[PDB]
Design a protein around this ligand. Sequence first.
Ligand SMILES: [Cu+2]
Ligand SMILES: [Cu+2]
Ligand SMILES: [Zn+2]
Ligand SMILES: [Zn+2]
Lengths: 151, 151
Amino acid sequence: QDLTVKMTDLQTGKPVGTIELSQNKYGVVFIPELADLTPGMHGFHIHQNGSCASSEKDGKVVLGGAAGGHYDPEHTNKHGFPWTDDNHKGDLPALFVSANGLATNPVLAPRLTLKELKGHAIMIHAGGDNHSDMPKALGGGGARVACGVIQ
Amino acid sequence: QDLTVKMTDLQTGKPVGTIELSQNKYGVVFIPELADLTPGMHGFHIHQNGSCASSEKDGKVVLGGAAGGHYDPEHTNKHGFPWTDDNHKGDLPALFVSANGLATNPVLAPRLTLKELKGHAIMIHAGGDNHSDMPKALGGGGARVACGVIQ
Ligand SMILES: [Cu+2]
Ligand SMILES: [Cu+2]
Ligand SMILES: [Zn+2]
Ligand SMILES: [Zn+2]
C-alpha cells in the first residue's frame, strides 16, 4: 500500500528521482528523493489526467500541459489549502528544495486517499504556492517543471 | 453624478444614516455617515438584487437575504480584493466603525462605475472581510446587518 512515482524533468527529459506514497491514519504522506531542482519552495499538486506529455495553448507549447488542471473530484473550481474543503482535492503542501538542489522533506495531505491517486499525475512547478488564486492564479506556481504518472 | 443611499439596520428596522456615492477618475468613492453599528471592520459589498428584504434558507430566516449574492457581472464565482480582477465586481474595501459606533472613513473601489450601481444593493455585514473564501466563505462577513438599495 505504498507506491513509487518516478519523476522526470520537463525541460531536460531526464529522471529526477522518485516520491514514495504511503497511506496513514491522518491522510497520504509524500516522501521525496529528488535532486536537480531549484532551491526554495515549489508548488506541488495532483493533476487530473494520467499524463505528463505536452499540450498546446494559443499557438504555444505547454510543457506537461497534458495532465490537465488540479485534481478536483468535487468540482470546486478554486485553489486553496490542504486542510480546507472547498478547493481542489489535489492541493498539497509546498515542496522545499535545498541549496544543493535536493528535495527530502516529507509532506502530509489529510484529505486524500492512496486508492484514488492511481492514474493521476504528480506535478512540481517552478513558482511557489500561496494557496490562493490571488494575486496569481493557482497560487503563483506558473510553469510545470517536473512530472510523473501515478501507477 | 453622486447618489445618496439610505442605510437601514436589518435587525432593528431603524435608519442608520447614509452613504454618498461619487465618481472619480480612479473609480467609485463611498463616503459613509453612519452610526449605531459595532466598532471594528465590517465586510462591505455590492449585492446582486435591488432589494434588502429577507429570504429563506432551509427553513430559516435570512435577513437581507433578498439582495442575493455579491455583484458579479463577470461571473467569477470567487470572492476577493478590490483591485484583483477574477472575483466579484462588488467586493469593496472593509468599513471601519469607531468605538462610538460611528462610520465616517471613505473608501475607493477602482473597478466600479457609478452608472452600473443603480438598482443594486449595498450591504454591511457583522463579520470582517479577509478578501478570500478561506477559511470562511465570502471573507468571513457572516450575517448581514445593514442594507440599502441604490436608487
Ligand atoms: Cu500543479
Ligand atoms: Cu456582502
Ligand atoms: Zn489547486
Ligand atoms: Zn465577494
